[model samples]
Target chain A: PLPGSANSRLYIPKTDQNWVVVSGVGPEDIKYGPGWFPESWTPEGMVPAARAGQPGNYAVAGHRVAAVFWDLDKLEEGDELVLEDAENFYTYQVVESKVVLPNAIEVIAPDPFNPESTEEPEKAYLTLTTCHPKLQNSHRLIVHAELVDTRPKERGMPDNIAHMAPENGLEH
Target chain B: PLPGSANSRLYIPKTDQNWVVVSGVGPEDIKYGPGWFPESWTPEGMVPAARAGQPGNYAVAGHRVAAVFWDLDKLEEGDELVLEDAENFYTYQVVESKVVLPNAIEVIAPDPFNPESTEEPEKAYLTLTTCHPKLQNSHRLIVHAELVDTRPKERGMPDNIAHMAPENGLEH
Candidate 1:
């Protein structure tokens, strides 16, 4: 993650999402890694088990502060969750989302929700995990998405959600 | 320069300076290069002509679009100009600033204002070049700064201009 970048950026059209996507190895360091070491102190982490745009479960974790994931619970089955690095934009369509126990590591598994069933990977999935019910870590919120489309940034933000970008994008 | 960053950030406290620093190579590419290729699209180009923290003229160029360089005209000798890459934060102090014709290529010279000087650089310098007037590119504004301090990112942002960062810094 690049300092002052909040790492990279995350855009969720449904919630007017334009959040920074950073990294952290674990929960402890995430509060200081790309997750929250930043000025805003928001935790955004991508575990080592994942890679951008690759097949398998690409999971990301962030704190449940206000807009950080405030409206996350409102996301329906077909929402869009786009994570961008310095290069391309990975677009994932929400397939399933729910509240789970904190110990559900299977949510990040290759097949997701079936950690013990080790089968060859067949699809690319994205998991947006955060503390459920905001303001409390009582439960975990997981938004599972499957890669639907990928686009090169050179063509500009995906037309489907171009409005997701900030209009006052320029500093002026 | 990172997208959505306005590139890297440029903070000149004297001008209440917290500006996005992107890159653009020539008069053209800079508009899209690190000069300003990303969002808010302010051109901030670090030319191949120079290297970061090196002992040469590390020059940057930008367009004069309001705060993008709005108060640059007020910068005086000894003012601070900080530039950051992904790994290190480079702090420079203004030693000279002026307006020159658009053709003044010497403003970006290794020795600054002395393009013909063939002698190897003995010191590191930073040159901030932008359009002259607020709305017109009729002329160029040049600010020359000498490297004064550099801090490794591991130490955090230099204390002097910490407040220049966004306060709502966190997305929440």
Candidate 2:
């Protein structure tokens, strides 16, 4: 099945980022979309996005609002991010975070430092993107995470999940 | 003459922030400012702004266009900010920095953390304000510098002024 064919949910404990992700969204969806819906887009037709648990750059875009992605700036290195698809829950660890200008398209490339690389990426990377300064889209905020583990959805959410409480171990 | 009574210029060597400052401006001036013109405004009428070298929050605001306060985010603590009025040149050293919401008015107050303080501030401070992210006004980027030294015009612009080259120690 295609990447966006399945329902995907993303959760990050460090900054309390929890949202439903819509794959294959283009620039317009990210610009005019309502709410803080996270989006995964591919350059070709803007639809060949990264598949969860895949060994590639799983980039996501979000709109910055007071109620959504509000705490994304607090995320630091070593923080964890989880993406749940239909079959598996992929876990990624934060590796880098930085702020760049709007025209900075390097953050979305498979290799941020090498945008023109024709080689395939060796490791799975999860890129979180949004507007900077909470209420502004003047610049782009980027956070990169590396896949650490992948678990089948039937096994339930990981106990290492810091975003969930005891009563909501299943996730609220 | 009052604080804004002179032709003032601001020069920050650390970030290359140089501009012609308009005193006693209000929000409209900032919103509709044509160029990278810096502005100083008061609270009562948004006109009685920070006088260079004054023992208070000598705050200034600028629009964050690509040619304006674009590099403001590059300013870090311990950096330097300079302002030159008709009679004297005041140097301020960066002390604090943070991204704040548009309503975070405390940044403009004499006592940022103590907005209700009735007592006058004893120390002179310089506050720089610009919109966050290069193209968005969702949040405000603020850089605060403390008064380091005040030099009179006859001193021929501080020799320590790094904003200028050898020939322009007089300040360009």
Candidate 3:
């Protein structure tokens, strides 16, 4: 999300349709559109899930609320992240984090594989990136996490399920 | 902007809107809103202006032309680039270039002056990033470039008062 906790939440039912993320809170704004994130957060902050047999990067990103939660760098390895698609819940763990220049777009790809060649690949990775360091637009800080488990909507989940993306990850 | 030549081309006014690069043929469908780049015949031989601004890295990336041109890493140090706002043009030059990690975002910041930190310096860096090496989901490449001059719709000389902006960068 851009800022504030209200806009920092995630969405579920994976919807890439219009009215998904409207520019205005009321009806007079841009009338919603597809390709926009459900929450006001950046696409990286989105809590993602892999589709059936779909090998690609499943990730999300959000703003670094300095007054409250600090920035993305505060997240360490082994941190538990829960993405509730309303009815289902998907859990992820932080595996690595690094600082990269703005040109390093590979981390945001589906299957960022090569470490030496510039050739594009086709796999799936879960990458998260945002403005690096503190409150500047110079560099980017990235966090790489891996998907662990997924839970359905009905089988008893946490309280957050009702708030952020309370459904499955495919609808979007 | 979608890794290929767009079906249409339109004029883009100097604004702060975000846009999603698309491949289409409609003039209005040029998709100029926010974070958007227009369609053009950019050769792959020249390093993207954004990447040349980096201090030590020169990563290359480009879209398809009908899918031609655009390789971003083979340009000379003094090479100049033409980034059309669709109709009018905003010119930039290749001053410096660098290859930073995914987290080296400071180079892209408006101000990269932190004498106390070990990070690199930042003045005006443009970045072109993608999955790093040949991977599709693991790493990312960072390329930075600096802004030399802005291509403006010249009306009069620099001494004239008409060249100034009136607190608006909108394209409508």
lDDT of each: 0.60, 0.61, 0.35
Q: Whose DockQ is greatest here?
A: 1
lDDT of 2 at B115: 51
Which digits, one per residue and each the tens of the lDDT, describe model 3 over residues A10-98? 22221211012221111111222211111111224312223211235543433334322134566678765554333555556677888
Better of 1 and 2 by lDDT: 2
Model number 1 iRMSD: 14.4
Model 2 docking grade: incorrect
lDDT of 2 by residue, B7-45 (tens): 356786765556655432233223322111122222532
Q: What share of the true interface contacts does each candidate keep?
A: 0.00, 0.00, 0.00
Model 2, A1-172: lDDT tens digits are: 0000233567887755565554322332232221111222234312133566676677776667654565778889999899876778899999999988876665766655555665666788888877787776777788889999999978988876644532221110
TM-score of each: 0.42, 0.42, 0.36
By summed lDDT, the worst window of 10 consecutive residues in model 3 chain A runs over A1-10
- Model 3: docking quality category: incorrect
How much does candidate 2 score in TM-score?
A: 0.42
Superposition error at B172 for model 1 (Å): 18
* Cα lDDT tens digits for candidate 1, B27-114: 3233322232111111232222445556667666665665466667888998888877556788999999888887666666566745
Against the true structure, candidate 3 has what lDDT?
A: 0.35
> Best candidate per TM-score, number?
1
Shift in Å, residue B69, candidate 3:
38
